Amino acid sequence: HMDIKACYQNAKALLEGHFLLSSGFHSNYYLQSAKVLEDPKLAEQLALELAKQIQEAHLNIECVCSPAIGGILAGYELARALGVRFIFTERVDNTMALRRGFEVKKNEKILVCEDIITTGKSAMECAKVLEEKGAQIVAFGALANRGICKRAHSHLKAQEGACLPSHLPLFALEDFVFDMHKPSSCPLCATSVAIKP
Ligand SMILES: [Zn+2]
Secondary structure (H helix, E strand, O other), X not given: OOOHHHXXXXXXXXXXXXXXXXXXXXXXXXXXXXXXXXXXXXHHHHHHHHHHHHHHOOOOOOEEEEEOOOOHHHXXXXXXXXXXXXEEEEEEOOEEEOOOOOOOOOOOEEEEEEEEEOOOHHHHHHHHHHHHOOOXXXXXXXXXXXXXXXXXXXXXXXOOOOXXXXXXXXEEEEEOOXXXXXXXXXXXXXXXXXXXX
């Protein structure tokens, strides 16, 4: 229904250039999700669209959790759209932890939401914190997917670097598949220097 790519493009959330990503791969694009989430009206509309997919799955989500900082707004709007509670994990002494008095009930059905899933590494660190507290991780969610992890309802395949488990669904609005080059085989490196975004 919502034109996802046009939303991100109009918001100037799509940076074109030469970037060294967290996976070690070089790309001609980078996504700045904060440029979309800056607008609560856009964030709500995207979260309502995401919730439709989640509800079709009948997973009985009781709580949405996000790893701080970037995943916070997306997960929070998703929790509002689902009519459930929202909690977040944060890095304390360089390790993911659940603070702020947030508590998890034993076997609480939690969806781990991010603003964007690249490798799914931060989402996995968040899920491990919750599982150790007795929670059941039933799904992963994101507004945008980088085509590294496979999302539900897509004909794309999971790639090298994917960290999310194969037995749990990932729900995302769209796949933002960019050129991914190995650093020793990057065509952009011939013309410019790759910078960390
Ligand atoms: Zn390069």
